[PDB]
Amino acid sequence: FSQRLDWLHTADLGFVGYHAEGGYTNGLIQMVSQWKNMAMVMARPVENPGSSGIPNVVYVAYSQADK
Amino acid sequence: CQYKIYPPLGIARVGNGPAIKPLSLSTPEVPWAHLYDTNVQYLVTQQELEQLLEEAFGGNVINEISQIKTKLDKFKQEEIETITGLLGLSHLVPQQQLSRSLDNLEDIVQQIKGALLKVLSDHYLHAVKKQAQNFYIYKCDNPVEKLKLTDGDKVTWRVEVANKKSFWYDYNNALDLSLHTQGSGNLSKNVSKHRLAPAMTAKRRNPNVITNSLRKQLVISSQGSVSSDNNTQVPLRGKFPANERHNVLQGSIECDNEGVLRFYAGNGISQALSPSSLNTDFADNSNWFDDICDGRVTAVVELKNGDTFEIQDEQSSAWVATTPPDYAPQIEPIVTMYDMVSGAALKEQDLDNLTTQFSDVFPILYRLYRMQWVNQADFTDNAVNTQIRELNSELGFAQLLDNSASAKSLREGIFNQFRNPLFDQDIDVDDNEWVSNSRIIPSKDETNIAAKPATSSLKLPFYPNDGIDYPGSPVQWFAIPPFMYQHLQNWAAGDFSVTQVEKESANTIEELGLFYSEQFKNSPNSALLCARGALDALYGGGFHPGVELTWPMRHNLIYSQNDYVSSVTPEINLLGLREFRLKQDLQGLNSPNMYQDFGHVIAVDNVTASIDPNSDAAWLWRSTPGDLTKWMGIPWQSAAASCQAVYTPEDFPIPSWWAANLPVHVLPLARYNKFKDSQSADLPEINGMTHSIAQGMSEETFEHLRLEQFSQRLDWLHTADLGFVGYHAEGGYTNGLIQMVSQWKNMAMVMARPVENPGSSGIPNVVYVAYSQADK
Numbered sequence: 039f040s041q042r043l044d045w046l047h048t049a050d051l052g053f054v055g056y057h058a059e060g061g062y063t064n065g066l067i068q069m070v071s072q073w074k075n076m077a078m079v080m081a082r083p084v085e086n087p088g089s090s091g092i093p094n095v096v097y098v099a100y101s102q103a104d105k
Numbered sequence: 106c107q108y109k110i111y112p113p114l115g116i117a118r119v120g121n122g123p124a125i126k127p128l129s130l131s132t133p134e135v136p137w138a139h140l141y142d143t144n145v146q147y148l149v150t151q152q153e154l155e156q157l158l159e160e161a162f163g164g165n166v167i168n169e170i171s172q173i174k175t176k177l178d179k180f181k182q183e184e185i186e187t188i189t190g191l192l193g194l195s196h197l198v199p200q201q202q203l204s205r206s207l208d209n210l211e212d213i214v215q216q217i218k219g220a221l222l223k224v225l226s227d228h229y230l231h232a233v234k235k236q237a238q239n240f241y242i243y244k245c246d247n248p249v250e251k252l253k254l255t256d257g258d259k260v261t262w263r264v265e266v267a268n269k270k271s272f273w274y275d276y277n278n279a280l281d282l283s284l285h286t287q288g289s290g291n292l293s294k295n296v297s298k299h300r301l302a303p304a305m306t307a308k309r310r311n312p313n314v315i316t317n318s319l320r321k322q323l324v325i326s327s328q329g330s331v332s333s334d335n336n337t338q339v340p341l342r343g344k345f346p347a348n349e350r351h352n353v354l355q356g357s358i359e360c361d362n363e364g365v366l367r368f369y370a371g372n373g374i375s376q377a378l379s380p381s382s383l384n385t386d387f388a389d390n391s392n393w394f395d396d397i398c399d400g401r402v403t404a405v406v407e408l409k410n411g412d413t414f415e416i417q418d419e420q421s422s423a424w425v426a427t428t429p430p431d432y433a434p435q436i437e438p439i440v441t442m443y444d445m446v447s448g449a450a451l452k453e454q455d456l457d458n459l460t461t462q463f464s465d466v467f468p469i470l471y472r473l474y475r476m477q478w479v480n481q482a483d484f485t486d487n488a489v490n491t492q493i494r495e496l497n498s499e500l501g502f503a504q505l506l507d508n509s510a511s512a513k514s515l516r517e518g519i520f521n522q523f524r525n526p527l528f529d530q531d532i533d534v535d536d537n538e539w540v541s542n543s544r545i546i547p548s549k550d551e552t553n554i555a556a557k558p559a560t561s562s563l564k565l566p567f568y569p570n571d572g573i574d575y576p577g578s579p580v581q582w583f584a585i586p587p588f589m590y591q592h593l594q595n596w597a598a599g600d601f602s603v604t605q606v607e608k609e610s611a612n613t614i615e616e617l618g619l620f621y622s623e624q625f626k627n628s629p630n631s632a633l634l635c636a637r638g639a640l641d642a643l644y645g646g647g648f649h650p651g652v653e654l655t656w657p658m659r660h661n662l663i664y665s666q667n668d669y670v671s672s673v674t675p676e677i678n679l680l681g682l683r684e685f686r687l688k689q690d691l692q693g694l695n696s697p698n699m700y701q702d703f704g705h706v707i708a709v710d711n712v713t714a715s716i717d718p719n720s721d722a723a724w725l726w727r728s729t730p731g732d733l734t735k736w737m738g739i740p741w742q743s744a745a746a747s748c749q750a751v752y753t754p755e756d757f758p759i760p761s762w763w764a765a766n767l768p769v770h771v772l773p774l775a776r777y778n779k780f781k782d783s784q785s786a787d788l789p790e791i792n793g794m795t796h797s798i799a800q801g802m803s804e805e806t807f808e809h810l811r812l813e814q815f816s817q818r819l820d821w822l823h824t825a826d827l828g829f830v831g832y833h834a835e836g837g838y839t840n841g842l843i844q845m846v847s848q849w850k851n852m853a854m855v856m857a858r859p860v861e862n863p864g865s866s867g868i869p870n871v872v873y874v875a876y877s878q879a880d881k
């Protein structure tokens with residue numbers, strides 16, 4: 039529950055691959071095509087959290103690279 | 106063996122001009138035929154567009170345009186696309202723009218023939234005309250006589266092409282540089298033997314596509330057939346990725362009533378699958394495709410009586426390859442692809458048995474001399490070209506045709522300025538490593554440690570070469586190949602012959618040039634002339650990778666046949682005429698080796714294995730469609746933009762790669778218009794000056810201004826906007842590669858133009874002027 043991912047890493051914004059440059063400017067350029075693949079946050083249930091400390095309603099980011 | 110195709114290796118060049126005869130060019134079928142033709146038009150002119158349009162208005166058309174004049178007494182969908190077609194022109198411009206051209210209207214013939222001339226000129230005005238190859242069927246006994254069709258007869262041509270650039274390996278350098286050999290006419294054994302420019306391993310292009318099955322998608326392919334009984338043009342259209350997805354016009358084919366095949370290349374369109382995928386490398390850019398092609402040309406001759414002759418063997422069939430445009434068609438490379446064919450069949454160790462006529466050496470001097478129109482070093486910094494000018498000054502050029510001792514010192518003094526392709530001069534040996542003591546071409550990655558001062562002069566020509574990657578290698582710089590160097594040494598020593606009629610036309614280099622030109626024009630073997638003419642405009646070095654083709658061409662193993670047959674004329678060799686043919690996979694596009702490779706890398710080890718024809722690798726030399734061009738840069742525009750100058754710390758001379766076909770320094774139109782007029786002209790503007798100013802100055806001064814203008818040469822890369830235009834424009838190498846994809850079609854085109862009265866200015870009667878929209 040505690041592992042949070044950079045939203046800019048939810049799709050390929052220029053940082054993927056051996057020696058990908060990544061960086062600010064490649065993110066601007068790649069977003070033109072990749073905006074439609076960025077993660078989409080949506081409320082989802084945890085039906086029996088028990089004593090874990092996870093709330094019954096979580097907000098989860100959905101993308102394809104995201105799993 | 107009864108019928109054969111010529112040329113054996115046809116060449117077609119891409120252009121955005123249309124694929125029609127009046128507005129296209131033809132690959133040379135005779136060497137040197139038009140070197141001084143001052144009426145050439147290698148870009149589509151307004152005149153050609155008007156005469157094209159007038160013909161389409163012949164002549165029914167006005168009849169039936171006045172048969173429409175009455176029933177308007179705007180247009181409308183139905184009378185739009187009836188006028189449309191009639192004028193046969195949607196094969197030139199999309200029907201829609203043709204229609205919204207007239208949809209938008211308000212002598213009726215003229216505003217039709219006027220609104221449509223505006224759409225034609227926007228599409229094609231100043232367009233790079235395509236250079237198409239004519240293929241001919243010849244009869245044999247050995248060719249003599251074209252084919253002549255009788256009524257009941259028919260020829261059917263077939264063509265299969267492919268582009269495998271995106272499928273193939275990175276181009277780092279020529280792999281044959283480390284291949285063990287006894288030496289050929291094109292490459293000395295010293296290069297490999299002494300490791301002067303080691304061949305480098307090369308990884309795959311588009312490496313993220315894995316498995317041979319999926320990599321087949323990286324190969325673009327197409328095929329078509331045309332006959333003598335129908336001159337309708339057939340497109341050669343493939344798709345990328347192969348069978349999202351873009352259509353790629355690889356070429357167009359046509360057959361006329363007489364049985365001659367005309368091959369047009371593509372429109373020069375290169376593109377990446379994503380706009381953000383930029384082509385920043387000179388050769389290896391993944392995610393890109395271009396419309397370059399090469400393939401297999403076959404035919405079937407079917408007669409009246411039903412006797413069918415099939416031309417599909419390798420000794421009788423032909424090949425075709427498309428290439429970038431020639432931006433200076435009348436300026437020949439110093440060493441051509443034909444020269445590599447000629448040298449491929451020769452052994453280095455047997456060059457002492459070669460025999461030389463002066464016509465064998467003249468082309469080197471003549472070509473190097475005419476390099477002055479495309480390269481500054483050869484205009485201002487080439488001691489041999491200046492000495493030739495001195496000879497012409499005195500009508501004394503014939504002295505170089507003198508084989509006697511009286512002329513030895515003169516012939517030697519020139520011969521000795523030329524680089525030796527043994528690559529064993531101007532070196533000091535470490536320990537063994539051969540290190541040049543002449544001027545090196547440094548890498549861009551600098552080391553702030555003082556250079557070792559050169560002790561030997563820089564030899565000719567001043568061009569980089571296949572070993573440019575290695576500072577201090579003698580192979581960083583280009584040498585004419587061993588067999589032509591042999592010709593030049595024989596000439597220097599006096600072991601050469603020449604006829605008296607040649608001496609009598611040799612007062613200047615130009616006088617002897619047109620004599621040798623007429624020899625070609627009156628040579629009787631049109632078949633072999635057409636085979637040579639197809640390759641004589643192509644470069645034959647250096648290969649990094651080159652412009653049109655690359656290093657596999659310099660090896661005899663790529664040819665199934667390569668034999669000398671004849672002098673150009675009985676007494677005048679002029680480097681000879683040869684019968685040559687490529688090794689071909691008779692299955693073509695359906696060959697099991699159409700998609701062969703060597704795994705994760707290619708290396709010289711693979712080429713070594715490919716020598717043995719029994720090997721798993723011998724397929725390398727048995728070309729399937731796409732095999733000749735796959736080595737070249739993808740897209741070709743980045744390679745061309747990289748095929749320019751390579752600057753040294755020393756300013757002069759400026760090294761240039763392949764300036765005969767991709768010029769480096771040109772004479773713009775704008776300068777031509779400032780020196781073509783004589784002071785006598787009766788114009789309000791004379792050479793860019795008012796009538797009053799031009800005629801008020803002394804004649805001395807007028808002529809000096811003419812030659813000052815003539816001497817202003819422009820960087821070819823500055824003839825269109827390649828990223829250097831505008832306030833705080835970055836310019837630079839990489840923006841050139843990127844912008845050439847769109848700007849190749851606006852680059853200046855060099856063409857011969859006249860100077861009616863040069864007077865005493867020093868300007869020649871024939872100049873070669875670079876035309877572009879920027880420089881006008």
Ligand SMILES: [Mg+2]
Pocket residue numbers: 431432433434435436437438642765766
């Ligand atoms: Mg040229």
